[PDB]
């Protein structure tokens, strides 16, 4: 939302992963001075003698960059009374926790959730190569300025890649191959040798989601167990 | 010999598909899939129970028929009596885990209760069993060594174990048991040079 | 997959093939999917009365398999006879556990709610089609994330998201519901359509683009 | 959604502790090819310590690479070994005009013993 | 390896003058009929393994190899195409050089295709096998 | 612990299931409940068979271990 | 598959005062008994050279403990057999390690302390005690480590 | 040539001067950790250009540490214990002697 | 070896992972036009460096389509 | 603490390492006019033909840079009366001494310690390649200006990585290896040759942190100690 | 290392294994680590009376070894031998020298301070567990950096910091204290909680993340 | 583009209406293709197809007079 017509706008918030389960968040008391969103495209155009060729390979990384500050005066908090300096220090500590032990040790969270209530947009983000940048200028005796660049992993609405479920209709495990392998392990050396010889004999004169219903993928798997248990040769075929 | 979770679940799903045409979905969270997974897990538990029981039988059962019993490490335990200053007026609560300590400087042993106990209002003397916090012979202690209770209740006057604890058996590997069983078996041989030589050693004076 | 199609008045099979597959030459194989005799499309209703099973007319539903499955003989054989059963098989079949639809809504994030039922005679009830998809989505939403004994990371954190009914909590709940709904690969995506918070009760609705 | 990757390389050495050796890693190369009759790898090391006096030749170095995140329960969490071989060369490297130095170690995947062992007459 | 087709051998240790074991290893391999290379032991992680197996170009042996998937999402760059650098019409596997046609039995029995030789005539590919 | 065929176990389980209700007595081959019960009974029978085989193997192993007659 | 033994060791192995801290019991281990029978019956290979001028070479035979204290000499043979027995299995043929147990090494160290203390009285023959003390702590490590090895293997 | 391993060889870019010549013995003292080095020069490549400075490569081979400057003594460790100690070469070291154990 | 022409060979720079090994069969599915490819691995070259990413070459020979 | 009205401002102070041991507590009498801190990240992005890959390796080396001017009027010192020019000259001398003495690759002693009392934070720093840039333009003729850039090694709370005391339980310096080496050295050449022969024979027959308690790694040490006190062959084994 | 666990109301061992390892199938190794019979968890406490050592009930402590040491048989044996007392191996046991804390606190940095003591009778006193770690940290803090005759750079320079009570001296003391505590690998890190300077004696407190 | 095809290349030197001597459409080279391969560095977001051949040396070079 915004200040026109609709009720008072909600400030931008950041969500970080808590080590001991759950989540912890961070809401900016002062809106950013600058907010830039870059959405480039990975497409190249090259012209031939008498035509233009255009090729594209999908969307590019949506880079998010914004700059803001912290008010000097205090304000109510969920717990305690934190001023601007304490808020900025906590932000630095959280960013260091996400970054310093990212490549080393382990971090429970795989991404950061970036909420834009003012702009009504949501993304999953990671720290950009530029990273956080903190500075205090001549005309800021007490204020603190923060500059951060981010790269969007993807839309927050979509689920995680690892938490995706496929169709998986019918049996997924080919149990026939499993019991064929189990039975073959008990075979003797001569049986395996004869199996190899039979496979070579068949091989050299060739050219001249498991579900039995509505499919034929698992055909030879069932035959292998039946051939082994019944016995087509000393060891079997195929 | 023994099956696995996948080996059972996949066969169950295959039989389910083969028997009926009314079911085709086997995604995660399905009621049928959940039931099959639970059945497979319980069957695997039964398989592991059978395997452990067979291992115990191999280790001990075949030889135990000859009256020989193996020594098993266990917590030291025994009866402990508690005396009150006056007869009780209300039912008292003694939850499990009540720590016991010995005031004697030479006995750092400690004991605790495994299960809850209660003293009736009419009762005035209660006997409660305790178990040592450590295994082996470390839990053994002579009579009248505890002399204290960690609960700090004002009603309790004194505490003492009436009998010494001696059930803290040590841990003995099966190698010694097998060796002694084999030695017993070999001693029964008759009409042999080694057996005859062994039979002469019973007399104390027969050495060389 | 296969796109549903309805026969239009005074329409030919060649135009139907050309509209979707682009090249009219594919119509020779498309007829085998529908399992139709030489009178593929006939306006006269009494003509179809002789053999309705092996004939089609205006207003009937056709099957339009994708190009990859067009050449598969197995797809042709399955689509020749199943006809309307393809959608049920495409979306799968599962046992129905909505014994008390009125009751399970009153106890959210509560265990020992769902149970089996009985329909027909002497057989456990079963669900299929879009109803099965909706039942699975509802069960996934109600199921907490880390409670199942196998294949973990199934469910949602809806029980933990109760709070001060503030807008940020509402957006968090919306995102959690969207992630839960979009976990299944069958569903394309989801998006909120309306938000309404009054007093101490959260209300809303969502739309899901189910394939086919 | 775009995949997230957090590589974490581990090195083990058997004749200095292997963990200390793996801490100073900067990069490595591993040239394996069936076309030629030799497999060779190279490892780049930092100049924090004087490796010339420590890493005696012919030592065995094992390299393990973490593909992706550990708690995410991805299939990549396997600590699959990428290559193992026998070192045969260590040398100082540095261009002091650029104000930087490095230590480079290279070896072959157990082809050194057979290659060097010549059945003489 | 091809036990059935290979007869008894008497490979000498000193076949190569002051040569490495790798040089003597090549003679035993009898390439390209057998593939030899060093690779990590997937079945036993933490140690290497020496592989010496018949070539996977056979139909059944080709199926025996484990399959690995990779989508286009992991492709940074690609350079793949056809090439006529290798082109042969007649193929044969002659025995060891000791045997000779003039003072011995049959020396070779090549194979060819009638249509292939039109574009590339009498292009031979000879390999000497020590086993035979 | 005794061997029992699949049919007896299935009949006993079906008889136990029918207690308390009469909305289940339909066990044609097409019924899915019959298929599930058949699979469960098959798994139980296989468990019994493997248990007996493992008991025999354990007896053999104990005979091996007691007298060291490998 | 056995390494040939030295002639001196083969000859050595093939056949009142009391300490207050440690005393002996003249008990032989099951593993030690088997090795003694094998050497007694089977003609094990032996070496011909005697370059190694250590261990019993000119120390256990040179000392007068053989003729002065034959009972003490029996203790030294028992320790050598127990020492040789444990070294035998680990180097080669580890199947015989099954018979060994904790109590086998415990008694051996007590025997070593008893003979070691007696040798301390003699001032000339401290060279033998020099090796025994080093060997004394070797058995203790096996005593506190043998149970883990069998379960691990 | 038995001491080819454990020696040091390579190329060095020293400051451009004419004092370095082929076949001359090179002495280097390391101020990084107070070490001393010795080398034998086998190749030199000079490069003069007003665009960037003036350099001079000094190829070296058969190097060793702990050198001594007195009278060109060099490194005492160069003449190691294996320098002169050796024996005549004959069979019986591997495979030959296995069949003669009568 | 008669089918050397009409086969596909070269080098591929796939994302750096340890799953690829010498002598393993490679399967590739092309999303550009819904095509399928098959290849036989003969060489792999890994490159790890914190300066720029982590790559892994996959040399291939004797390739063919419609897998 | 900053000038928040509750506590007086505390000025930033440095702490250089003295040549003869200890440290010198250098304190600025005027806070820097400009303060900038950078937190770059080692994240890298590579575009595949069908998807974007995001890869991160962890926190990169931070950079600290600031600029300010020294006071003009005289100000008392804890052990004298030093003007601004004397303070600047002392700072330049200290920086030159710290830079020149680091000719051995890196100083074995502690690095530069930075104490930022304006906002609660501490760091261990080193001289950046930019170095101490000093200038004095026509504007403000009697006021000096200094520009300092630094690179952060790590937080001052944590000690040196290599100086951390490990567990070191049991014995890292076992006597078994030492006495085995002494015995092998004392053995004759023929004894060592026979030991090598026995080792080769045993190798042929292969086929066809240390603690005496609760550890198996030191098993070989006990066995390698034996075979010398007992003549298990003419020499030791393994 | 390991992680402590308390059995929930009728909790399942397989659920515990899934939670602490992700894969459910690793429960077979965990029970072997804990050395428990088939009745791994029983709601009734009276059942534990039969075999207390080999039977766990509700509220019973359990050991969760790390993933790397899951299949190590030696780790299984050692954990079985040291059930519920496994912390002692890492921290270790050492002789107790803090005979009386009421006396030596006032003296502070000086010589002739500590001495051995005897607890009970006969057996020499030995400090084990968390008390041993605290004693080691206190001894390291009190000792000078370069006092002992071996392995120098052990101790702290606290005795040189006595002087002015200005804030920068307090921050220097804080940094020195944090440096001294972090010198031990057994402590992950440390940070200040509160500081106080009243009168002419510095006061403060610190917290250390002691492992296990 | 099947292999072994013939490709002819013509280059226009200068302007046509200017009536320069360069207006000759002189052939620069003709030969037989023997290789076609995909090329592309998707990091740079660009791809190309490369074809190479020889000027009628392929038939004589490949035609080996065997024994």
Which 3-state string (H, E, C) describes chain E?
CCCCCCCCCCCCCCCCCCCEHHHHHHHHHCCCCEEEEEEECCCCCCCEEEEEEECCCCHHHHHHCCEEEEEHHHEEEEEEECCCCCCCCEEEEECCCCCCCCCCCCCCCCECCCCHHHHCCCCEEEEECCCC
Interface test with chain J among K87, K139, K154, K172, by most J beta carbons within 10 Å: K172
Residue found under tokens 């070797």: G138
| Nearest partner of B131 among B118, B151, B146, judged by Cα | B146
Task: Enumerate the β-bridge partners of residue I10.
Answer: E80, I60
How many residues does this entry show for chain C? 212
Spatial contact of F6 and F42, defined as CB atoms under 8 Å apart? yes
Query: Residue C17, Cβ neighbours under 10 Å: how many?
Result: 20
What chain L residue is nearest to J53 in terms of C-alpha separation? L43
Closest chain C C-alpha to K23 CA, distance in angstroms: 8
Other CB atoms within a 10 A radius of the CB of residue C116 amount to 13
Residues of B in contact with F35 (CB under 8 A): 15-16, 18-20, 23
Distance CA A233, CA G71 (A): 72
Residue closest to J16 by CA, chosen among J80, J91, J87, J83: J91
Name the closest residue on chain C to residue B38, using Cα atoms.
C149
* Residues facing K144 on adjacent strands: K156
> DSSP character for B59?
I
- DSSP letter at F59 equals H
C-alpha F7/C-alpha A88 separation (Å) is 74
Q: What share of chain J is helix, strand, coil (3-state, %, to 5)?
A: 20, 25, 50
- What's the Rg (C-alpha) of chain D? 17
Q: Cα dihedral sign for G113, G118, G119, G121? A: positive
For K121-175, the DSSP string reads: SSSBPEEETHHHHHHHHHHHHHSBTT-SSSS-S-SB-GGGG-S---HHHHHHHHH
Q: Counting beta carbons within 10 angstroms of the beta carbon of residue A132, is it exposed (0 to 12), middle (13 to 18) or buried (19 or more)?
A: buried
First to last CA, chain E: 14
Question: J176, J221 in Cβ contact below 8 A?
Answer: yes
Question: How far is residue J126's CA from residue K112's CA, in Å, rounded to a whole number?
Answer: 41
Do residues H16 and H71 touch, judged by C-beta distance below 8 A?
no
Q: Chain H contact for J104, CB < 8 A?
A: yes
Q: Where are the beta strands (DSSP E) in chain F?
A: none
Nearest alpha-carbon partner for K124 in K97, K95, K98, K104 = K95
Token digits of residue H86: 């050796």
Give the residue from K56, K133, K146 showing the smallest Cα distance to K92. K133
Beta bridge partners of J72: none
Contact C19, C71 (CB under 8 A): no
CA-based nearest residue to J43, from A100, I52, D69: I52
3-state DSSP assignment of residue E52: strand
J29 phi/psi in degrees, rounded to 5: -85, -10
**3-class state of residue B176 by DSSP:** helix
What was the resolution (in A) of this experimentally determined structure? 4.4
Q: How far apart are CA G47 and CA K167, in angstroms?
A: 81
CA distance B30 to C127: 12
Taking the CB of residue A15, how many other CB atoms lie within 10 A of it? Answer: 21
Query: Tokens 């019960």 belong to which residue?
Result: F37
Instruction: Identify the residue whose tokens are 């990585």.
Output: J161
Q: Which residues pair with A56 in a beta bridge?
A: A43
CA distance J87 to J28: 9
What are the tokens at J229?
């006190």
Strands K126-128 and J63-69, by their bridges, are unpaired
Find chain K residues with C-beta within 8 A of G148's C-beta: 74, 77
Tell the residue number behind the tokens 């798997």, with chain if given: A221
User: B4: how many CB neighbours lie within 10 A of its CB?
Assistant: 13
**How far is the C-alpha of K92 from the C-alpha of K82, rounded, in Å?**
13
Displacement of CA J67 from its chain's centroid (Å): 27
Q: Is D63 exposed, middle or buried (0-12, 13-18, 19+ CB in 10 A)?
A: buried
Measured in angstroms, the CA of H71 and the nearest CA of chain D are apart by: 27
The residue whose two tokens read 């969502």 is: C206
Q: Taking a C-beta distance cutoff of 8 angstroms, is the pair J72, J142 a contact?
A: yes
Minimum Cα–Cα distance from J108: chain H residue: H33
User: Which of H13, H7, H24, H25 is closest to H58 using CA atoms?
Assistant: H13
Quick one: residue E94, left, alpha or beta (phi over 0 = left, psi -120 to 50 = alpha)? beta
Report the C-alpha gap between A211 and F48 in whole angstroms: 28
Most distant CA pair in chain F, distance: 60
Closest of J140, J149, J118, J152 to residue J30, by C-alpha? J118
Our CA-based measurement puts residue A152 at a distance from the nearest CA of chain L, in whole angstroms, of: 19
Q: Where are the alpha helices (DSSP H) in chain C?
A: 13-21, 27-34, 45-49, 67-70, 73-81, 85-91, 101-104, 130-142, 167-182
Q: What is the DSSP letter of B57?
A: I
Rounded-to-integer distance, Cα D6 and Cα D72, Å: 11
CA angle E73, E76, E79 (to 5 degrees): 115
The verdict on J52 touching L (C-beta cutoff 8 Å) is no
**Nearest CA among A93, B82, A12, I23 for reference residue E35:** I23
- The residues, any chain, with a CB within 8 Å of residue J149's CB and separated by 6 or more, are J63, J64, J65, J128, J129, J130, J131
Cα–Cα distance measured from residue K204 to residue C12, given in angstroms and rounded to the nearest whole number: 92
Beta strand ranges found along chain E (DSSP E):
34-40, 48-54, 67-71, 75-81, 90-94, 124-128
How many CB atoms are closer than 10 A to CB B96? 14
Q: Which of G146, G150, G152, G153 is the mutation pick for testing K, counting most K CBs within 10 A?
A: G152
Q: How far apart are alpha carbons K48 and B74 in whole angstroms?
A: 13
Instruction: Count other Cβ atoms within 10 Å, centred on residue A78.
Output: 8
- CA nearest to E16, candidates J12, F33, D118: D118
Q: How far apart are CA D121 and CA D100, in angstroms?
A: 49
E47 burial class (0-12, 13-18, 19+ CB within 10 angstroms)? Answer: exposed
Token pair 């020195």: residue: K176
For G21, residues 6+ apart whose C-beta sits below 8 A from its C-beta are: G113, G117
CA atoms within 13 A on the CB side of B132: 25
Residue K178 CB neighbours (<10 A): 22
Contact A236, A227 (CB under 8 A): yes
E13 to chain I, minimum CA–CA distance in Å? Answer: 29
**Torsion angle of C-alpha atoms K181, K182, K188, K192, degrees rounded to 10:** 60
Give the DSSP letter of residue A54: E
Q: Give the C-alpha separation, B20 to C93, whole Å.
A: 11
Give the residue from chain E lying closest to A197, CA to CA: E4
Can you read off the two tokens belonging to residue J54? 């995001």
Of residues L59, L47, L63, the one with CA closest to residue L3? L59
A214, C69 in Cβ contact below 8 A? no
- Which run of H or of E encompasses A230? helix A219-230
Check if the beta carbon of residue J222 is closer than 8 Å to that of residue J175: no
List the one residue out of D51, D49, D48, D31 whose CA is nearest residue D40.
D31
Q: With contact defined as beta carbons under 8 Å apart, do G84 and J233 qualify?
A: no
User: What is the rounded distance in angstroms from the CA atom of residue A189 to the CA atom of residue A187?
Assistant: 7
Separation CA A72–CA K72 (nearest Å): 57
Pick from K69, K58, K87: nearest CA to K32? K69
Task: Please name the residue that has the structure tokens 């750079």.
Answer: K153
From chain A residues 194-223, the ones with a CB under 8 A of any chain E CB are 197, 199-200, 202-204, 206
Say how far apart CA A70 and CA A41 lie, in whole Å.
Answer: 34
Which residue from D60, D45, D38 is spatially nearest to D114, judged by alpha carbons? D38
- Give the DSSP letter string of A45-108: EEE-SS-EEEEEEEEPP-EEEEEEE--SS----SSS---HHHHHHHHHHHHHHHHHTTSSS--S
**Maximum Cα–Cα distance across chain K:** 68
Q: CA gyration radius for chain K?
A: 23
Q: Name the experiment that determined this structure.
A: cryo-EM
- Distance in angstroms (rounded) separating the CA atoms of residues H79 and H2: 11
- Select from K16, K18, K50, K51 the least CA-distant residue to K35: K51
Q: Which residue has the tokens 């400090």?
A: K127
Contact D9, D66 (CB under 8 A): yes
The set of chains that have 3 or more CB pairs under 8 A with C is: A, B, F, K
Task: Give the C-alpha separation, C172 to A25, whole Å.
Answer: 11
Beta-bridge partner residues of D94? D101
Residue that has been written with the tokens 């290789």 in this structure: L35
Per DSSP, A61 falls in state P
Among residues K4, K18, K19, which one has the least CA distance to residue K62? K4
Q: Which residues contact K193 (CB under 8 A, 6 or more apart)?
A: K205, K206, K207
Residue from the list D28, D34, D82 with its beta carbon closest to the beta carbon of I42: D34
Residue B132 token pair: 């040592």
How far is residue K124 from each of residues B108, C135, G104, K97, K120, measured CA to CA in Å? Answer: 13, 70, 30, 11, 8
| Cβ pair G109, G18 in contact under 8 A | no
Distances (CA, A) of A161 to C149, D72, J43: 21, 10, 20
- Spatial contact of D13 and D78, defined as CB atoms under 8 Å apart: no
Measured between beta carbons, which residues in chain B are less than 8 angstroms from residue A169? 24-26
DSSP helix/strand/coil, G131: helix
Residue A134: left if φ>0, alpha if ψ -120 to 50, beta else—which one? beta
Rounded to whole angstroms, how far apart are CA atoms L38 and E78?
7
Cross-strand pairs, J134: J146
Residue D2's CB is within 10 A of a number of other CB atoms, namely 19
Quote the longest CA-to-CA distance of chain H: 79
Give the gyration radius of chain J's Cα atoms: 31
Cα–Cα distance for residue pair K31/K79, rounded to 1 Å: 11
The DSSP string of A189-217 is HHHHHHHHHHHHHHHTT----B-STT--T
CA atoms of K136 and K159, how far apart (whole Å): 18
For residues K143, K144, K146 and K152, what is the CA-based torsion angle, rounded to 10 degrees? 40
Given a contact cutoff of 8 angstroms between Cβ atoms, the answer to whether A2 and A9 are in contact is: yes
Cross-chain Cβ contact A175/B27 below 8 Å: no
Within 10 angstroms of residue G138's Cβ, the number of other Cβ atoms is 20
Q: How far apart are CA A89 and CA A81, in angstroms?
A: 14
The number of CA neighbours under 13 Å toward the Cβ of B120 is 2
Query: Does an H or E element contain J67, and which?
Result: strand J63-69
Per the listing, tokens 């968040």 go with: A25
Residue J58, Ramachandran bin (φ over 0: left; ψ between -120 and 50: alpha; else beta): left
- Chain B CB contacts of F59 under 8 Å are 57, 62
Task: For chain B, positions 40-79, list CB contacts with chain C under 8 A.
Answer: 41
Cβ atoms I25, I40 nearer than 8 A: yes
CB-based contact J234:G51 (threshold 8 Å):
yes
Question: Counting beta carbons within 10 angstroms of the beta carbon of residue L6, is it exposed (0 to 12), middle (13 to 18) or buried (19 or more)?
Answer: exposed
Cβ contact K29:K18 at 8 Å: no
By Cβ distance, the residue of J46, J49, J53 closest to E72 is J49
Cα separation, L19 vs F32, in Å, equals 90
Q: With CA atoms as reference, report the closest residue to A83 among J128, A91, B133, K187.
A: A91
| Residue in C152, C88, C79, C75 with CA at minimum distance from that of residue C126 | C88
Could you tell me which residues are beta bridge partners of residue H13?
H57
The conformation of residue A206, written as its DSSP 8-state character, comes to -
């Amino acid at each position: 939302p915004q200040s026109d017509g609709i009720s008072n706008l909600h400030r931008i918030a950041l969500r970080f992963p808590k080590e001991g389960g759950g989540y912890d968040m961070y809401r900016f008391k002062v809106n950013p001075e600058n907010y830039t969103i870059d959405s480039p495209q990975r497409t190249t155009a090259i012209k031939t003698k008498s035509d233009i060729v255009i090729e594209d390979y999908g969307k590019d990384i949506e880079v998010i960059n914004f700059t803001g500050t912290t008010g000097f005066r205090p304000v109510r908090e969920a717990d305690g009374l934190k001023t601007g300096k304490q808020k900025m220090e906590e932000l630095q500590s959280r960013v260091s926790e996400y970054a310093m032990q990212g490549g080393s040790g382990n971090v429970s969270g795989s991404y950061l959730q970036f909420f834009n209530f003012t702009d009504d947009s949501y993304y999953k983000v990671h720290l950009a190569p530029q990273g956080l940048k903190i500075t205090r200028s001549k005309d800021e005796p007490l204020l603190f300025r923060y500059e951060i660049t981010l790269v969007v992993i993807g839309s927050l609405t979509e689920a995680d890649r690892s938490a995706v479920t496929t169709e998986e209709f019918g049996n997924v495990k080919p149990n026939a191959s499993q019991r064929v392998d189990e039975g073959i392990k008990e075979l003797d050396k001569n049986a395996r040798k004869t199996r190899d010889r039979n496979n070579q004999e068949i091989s050299r004169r060739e050219n001249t989601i498991y579900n039995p219903r509505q499919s034929t993928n698992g055909l030879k798997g069932n035959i292998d167990n039946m051939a082994l248990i019944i016995g087509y040769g000393d060891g079997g075929v195929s | 010999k023994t099956r696995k979770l996948t080996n059972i679940l996949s066969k169950l799903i295959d039989k389910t598909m083969a028997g009926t045409s009314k079911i085709t979905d086997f995604t995660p969270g399905s009621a049928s899939r959940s039931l099959l997974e639970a059945v497979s897990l319980e069957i695997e538990q039964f398989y592991i129970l059978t395997k452990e029981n067979i291992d115990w039988g191999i280790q001990e059962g075949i030889i135990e028929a000859f009256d020989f019993q193996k020594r098993q490490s266990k917590r030291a335990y025994g009866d402990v009596t508690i005396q009150f200053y006056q007869p009780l007026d209300m039912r008292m609560y003694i939850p499990a885990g009540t720590t016991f300590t010995s005031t004697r400087q030479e006995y750092p042993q400690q004991f605790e209760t495994l299960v809850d106990y209660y003293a009736e209002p009419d009762s005035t003397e209660i006997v409660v069993e305790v178990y040592c916090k450590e295994t082996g012979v470390a839990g053994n202690v002579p009579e009248g060594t505890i002399n204290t209770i960690a609960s700090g209740s004002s009603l309790i006057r004194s505490v003492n174990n009436e009998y010494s604890f001696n059930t803290g058996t040590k841990e003995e590997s099966q190698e010694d048991f097998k060796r002694r069983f084999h030695s017993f078996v070999e001693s029964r041989g008759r009409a042999t040079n080694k057996s005859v030589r062994y039979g002469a050693l019973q007399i104390p004076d027969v050495e060389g | 997959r296969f796109k549903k199609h309805v026969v239009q008045h005074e329409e030919t099979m060649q135009a139907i093939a050309q509209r979707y597959y682009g090249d009219v030459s594919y119509w020779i194989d498309l007829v085998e999917h529908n399992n139709l005799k030489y009178p593929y499309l006939v306006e006269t209703d009494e003509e179809k009365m002789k053999d309705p099973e092996r004939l089609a007319s205006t207003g009937d539903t056709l099957i339009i398999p994708i190009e990859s499955d067009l050449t598969d003989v197995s797809a042709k054989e399955i689509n020749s006879r199943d006809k309307d059963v393809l959608v049920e098989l495409a979306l799968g079949r599962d046992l129905n556990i909505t014994a008390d639809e009125k009751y399970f809504n009153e106890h959210g994030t509560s265990d020992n709610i769902l149970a089996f039922s009985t329909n027909g005679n002497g057989d456990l009830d079963t669900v299929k089609g879009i109803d099965n998809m909706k039942q699975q989505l509802q069960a996934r939403l109600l199921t907490p994330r880390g409670s199942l004994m196998l294949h973990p990371n199934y469910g949602s954190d809806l029980h933990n998201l109760f709070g001060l009914n503030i807008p940020e909590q509402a957006t968090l709940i919306e995102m959690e519901v969207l992630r839960t709904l979009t976990s299944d690969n069958r569903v394309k995506s989801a998006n909120l359509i309306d938000w309404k918070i009054q007093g101490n009760v959260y209300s809303g609705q969502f739309s899901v683009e189910i394939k086919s | 959604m775009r995949r997230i990757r957090r590589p974490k390389v581990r090195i083990e050495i058997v004749t200095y502790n292997g963990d200390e050796f793996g801490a100073k890693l900067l990069g490595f190369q591993t040239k394996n090819s069936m076309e030629d009759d030799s497999s060779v790898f190279q490892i780049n090391m930092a100049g924090d310590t004087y490796w010339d006096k420590l890493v005696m030749a012919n030592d065995i170095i094992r390299i393990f690479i973490t593909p992706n995140d550990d708690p995410n329960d991805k299939e990549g969490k396997q600590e699959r070994l990428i290559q193992v071989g026998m070192v045969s060369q260590v040398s100082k490297v540095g261009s002091y005009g650029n104000d930087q130095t490095q230590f480079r170690i290279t070896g072959q995947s157990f082809v050194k013993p057979f290659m060097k062992f010549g059945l003489g007459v | 390896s091809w036990d059935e087709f290979e007869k008894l051998t008497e490979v000498s240790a000193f076949t190569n003058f002051d040569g490495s074991l790798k040089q003597l290893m090549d003679m035993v391999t009898a390439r390209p009929f057998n593939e030899l290379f060093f690779k990590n032991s997937e079945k036993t992680p933490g140690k290497a393994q020496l592989v010496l197996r018949k070539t996977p170009f056979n139909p059944t042996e080709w199926r025996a190899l484990d399959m690995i998937k990779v989508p286009t999402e992991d492709f940074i760059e690609e350079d793949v195409g056809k090439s006529d650098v290798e082109t042969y019409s007649i193929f044969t596997a002659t025995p060891a050089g000791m045997l000779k046609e003039l003072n011995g039995d049959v020396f070779s029995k090549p194979q060819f295709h009638p249509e292939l030789t039109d574009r590339y005539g009498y292009t031979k590919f000879e390999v000497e096998n020590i086993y035979l | 612990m005794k061997t029992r065929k699949l049919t007896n176990i299935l009949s006993k389980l079906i008889d136990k299931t029918m207690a308390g209700t009469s909305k289940i007595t339909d066990f044609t081959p097409g019924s899915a409940s019959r298929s599930l019960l058949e699979a469960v009974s098959l798994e139980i029978e296989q468990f019994y068979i493997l248990t007996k085989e493992n008991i025999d193997w354990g007896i053999q192993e104990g005979i091996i271990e007691a007298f060291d007659f490998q | 598959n056995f390494i040939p033994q030295p002639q001196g060791l083969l000859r050595f192995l093939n056949t009142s005062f009391v300490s207050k801290f440690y005393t002996p019991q003249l008990q032989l281990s099951e593993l030690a008994k088997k090795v003694l029978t094998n050497i007694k019956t089977d003609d094990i290979p032996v070496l011909e050279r005697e370059f190694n001028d250590n261990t019993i070479i000119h120390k256990a035979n040179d000392t007068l403990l053989k003729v002065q204290a034959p009972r003490m000499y029996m203790i030294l043979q028992s320790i050598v057999l127990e020492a040789y027995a444990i070294v035998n299995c680990f180097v080669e043929n580890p199947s015989s390690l099954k018979y060994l147990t904790e109590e086998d090494v415990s008694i051996t160290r007590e025997n070593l302390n008893y003979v070691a203390d007696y040798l301390g009285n003699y001032d000339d023959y401290n060279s033998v005690v020099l090796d025994l003390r080093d060997l004394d702590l070797c058995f203790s490590a096996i005593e506190l480590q043998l149970p883990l090895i069998k379960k691990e293997a | 040539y038995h001491g080819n391993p454990n020696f040091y060889a390579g190329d060095i870019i020293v400051l451009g001067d004419p004092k370095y010549d082929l076949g001359k013995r090179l002495f280097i003292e390391d101020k990084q950790r107070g070490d001393t080095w010795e080398f034998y020069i086998e190749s030199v490549e000079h490069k003069f250009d007003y665009k960037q400075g003036y350099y001079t490569t000094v190829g070296v081979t058969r190097g060793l540490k702990d050198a001594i400057l007195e009278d060109g003594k060099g490194s005492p460790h160069r003449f190691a214990g294996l320098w002169n100690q050796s024996s005549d070469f004959m069979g019986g070291l591997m495979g030959e002697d296995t069949s003669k154990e009568l």
